[PDB]
């Protein structure tokens, strides 16, 4: 399938290990489209959580259920970045609007000093 930046998918992030990303959850594709369309086997994504507490962390981005069509109000956790096999992405949810992705972009530059 074709994977595009700003898309939300579900992925199994695997067993917990301390605070690292884990478990089955929605993820937001943040890898750029030329890499997504390339032979690169992987895609980079930010973890999404329904934990309303993380919305208060600087850089994180609120995702209203009415926007995403996810079951619950959720948050993009820009401090939680994973690299997944493209084939790991399942149950495509939709694409986050440009205005919200711009906030994600600003958050990623903040957390990565870019």
Tokens of 37: 């369309």
Range in contact with a second copy (rule: CB under 8 A) among 13-21, 48-56, 64-72, 90-98: 13-21
Binder among 23, 24, 33, 71 for a second copy (CB under 8 A): 33
Binder among 11, 26, 28, 31 for a second copy (CB under 8 A): 31
CA distance 41 to 9: 16
Sequence-ordered strand ranges (E) for 13-73: 24-29, 42-49, 61-63
Whose Cβ is closer to a second copy: residue 93's or residue 101's?
101
Binder among 1, 2, 18, 69 for a second copy (CB under 8 A): 18
Q: Which residues bind a second copy (CB under 8 A)?
A: 5, 14-15, 17-21, 30-33, 35, 40-42, 44, 57, 79-85, 87-88, 105, 108-114
């Amino acid at each position: 399938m074709v994977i595009s930046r700003a898309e939300i998918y579900w992925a199994d992030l695997g067993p917990p290990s301390g605070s690292q990303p884990a478990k089955r959850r929605p993820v937001l594709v943040i890898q750029s489209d030329p890499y997504n369309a390339s032979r690169l086997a992987t895609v980079i994504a930010a973890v999404i959580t329904s934990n309303d507490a993380l919305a208060a962390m600087p850089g994180n981005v609120d995702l209203p259920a009415t926007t995403t069509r996810l079951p619950r109000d959720s948050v993009v956790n820009v401090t939680a970045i994973v690299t997944l096999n493209k084939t790991d992405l399942t149950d495509r949810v939709g694409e986050v609007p440009a205005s919200l992705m711009h906030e994600v972009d600003r958050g990623l530059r903040r957390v990565l000093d870019l």
